[PDB]
Design a protein around this ligand. Structure first.
Ligand SMILES: [Ca+2]
Length: 45
């Protein structure tokens, strides 16, 4: 119920990646697996 994901408030990519919360609703694949930009997380379009 408290996901850190890289630092205490970031993004975990299903490719297997810690990157930063910018990428969440940024609208690029960014993750390369496009985790954030599938609406399991957000998807800016
Ligand atoms: Ca993104």
């Amino acid at each position: 119920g408290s996901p850190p994901q890289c630092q205490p408030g970031e993004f975990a990519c299903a490719n297997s990646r810690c990157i930063q919360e910018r990428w969440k609703c940024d609208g690029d694949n960014d993750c390369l697996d496009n985790s954030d930009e599938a609406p399991a997380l957000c998807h800016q379009h």
